[PDB]
Amino acid sequence: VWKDADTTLFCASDAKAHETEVHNVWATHACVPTDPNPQEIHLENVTENFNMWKNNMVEQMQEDVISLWDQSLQPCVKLTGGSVIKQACPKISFDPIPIHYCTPAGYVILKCNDKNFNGTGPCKNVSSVQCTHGIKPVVSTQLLLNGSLAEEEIIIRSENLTNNAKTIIVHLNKSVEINCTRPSNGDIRKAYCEINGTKWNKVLKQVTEKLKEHFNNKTIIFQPPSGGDLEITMHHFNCRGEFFYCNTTQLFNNTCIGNETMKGCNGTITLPCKIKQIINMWQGTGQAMYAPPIDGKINCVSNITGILLTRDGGANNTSNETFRPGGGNIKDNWRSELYKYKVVQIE
């Protein structure tokens, strides 16, 4: 017997105390070592309701990551309002480590084991764990990187598909590798990302297939973002401490969604990226200026495990739906991982 409740949780990680890497330095002081023997106790004949979108666990992870970045990233100048802060601008070691979230005494985490669970609604297959899996605090937009894959099949997640203001999280059951790099030695700002277009367009075609069935048989078509900060209109992520902005226009080409049956665009698609020094802080408000990129090959290979989308609204007579690479609320990056968890109190 129990009830839905919200309490202060504690994190855990395999963080190395000596490591000079940003994430390790924070988890060292903030988190406890990982439990060697995860005790996952299945619950017989139990059916609980989950609400991926109304889960306090997300709020706590946010404040954590925010805390991490606040005392990790060191901008040369940070203009927030009429104020101006100038500090040291040393380069830093940046690579996100897996973080687990555990419950105190008196509480427990209910893990949903259903294969095609869409984040909200009843769950017939519920187990009981003391900690979550290794979630990487990877901030990004449009594309979800280094996450977990969908168990059985591609899952379209949303609090309400009919509500165009509710963001959509596409959960891939097959990860596609993205190979972003900035060749050593033109311009030191420019970089690029290589994706196996053949394998990508194949997976993205299955996404449009899953997007139907939810929106009748309407023709699913993608389009680039309609506006916003460069952090939103482009694939934004932090690699090796440097801030990358990748142009994903040709990553959502409709023509190649109908496969390269008679269309020339095989091989590998390379996305035009750039390393910016002036960025808009996602943590709070304001702009930050960072030092010029380090010399040498800057490369980070990531796993595309999810896509953030936003559906256009206005027409009802139309015979199709339009989706655009979404993002902006980092909390959704944590929802794409905590969807199958829920905190309850034993009584």
Binding site: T162, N163, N164, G313, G314, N316
Partner: protein, 208 residues
């Protein structure tokens, strides 16, 4: 998707207004009031949940797709235009206005053939007048060669006379000259609360 009705609602301060809005999709319906000049105001949301600062006279009901907004006792400030909403979509709106009650009056019907001056220049307009009547509810119906027609007649009602408190309706049937030549008999069937039977005024093309 949101079909609201009626389009206009003539009532007296004291009666109860009933506005309906039939939806089809899955969503939470809301209601809005707009007094002349001022900005829209939230009345009901989530179907029946009354808003903040709203009298308990406003009430909302729902049975499936169909919705109802009802004012229990209209006042000088309850008149205006109401819109039903679902997500980003709104209804055409319902205009509730004052209707000084009087005794039932019968609509005197007239009919005017298109002018030769108009035929020479493209199209032909046929007018049907309903002068001085009450109440406002009156259904004009065009017939050509004893054949019902719809979609090509646009009506227009006057403000209630501030003397005899009557109304006047102008139903204009627009046709093309080429199509006006073919048919012979034009008539407008009028049905009103003050008429014991549908009145029919007609005229035969050409002969006057």
């Amino acid at each position: 998707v949101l079909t609201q009705s009626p389009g206009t609602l003539s009532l007296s301060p004291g009666e109860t207004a009933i506005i309906s809005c039939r939806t089809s999709q899955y969503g939470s319906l809301a209601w809005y009031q707009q007094r002349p000049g001022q900005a829209p105001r939230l009345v009901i949301y989530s179907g029946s949940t009354r808003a903040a600062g709203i009298p308990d006279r406003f009430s909302g009901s729902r049975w499936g797709p169909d919705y109802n907004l009802t004012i229990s006792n209209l006042e000088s400030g309850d008149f205006g235009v109401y819109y039903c909403q679902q997500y980003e979509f709104f209804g055409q709106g319902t205009k509730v206005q004052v209707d000084i009650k009087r005794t039932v009056a019968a609509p005197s019907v007239f009919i005017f053939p298109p002018s030769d001056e108009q035929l020479k220049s493209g199209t032909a307009s046929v007018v049907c007048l309903l002068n001085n009547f009450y109440p406002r509810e009156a259904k004009v119906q065009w017939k050509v060669d004893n054949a019902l027609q719809s979609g090509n007649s646009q009506e227009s009602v006057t403000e209630q006379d501030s003397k005899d408190s009557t109304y006047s309706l102008s139903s204009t049937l627009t046709l093309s000259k080429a199509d006006y030549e073919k048919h012979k008999v034009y008539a407008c069937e009028v049905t009103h609360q003050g008429l014991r039977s549908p009145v029919t005024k007609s005229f035969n093309r050409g002969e006057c």
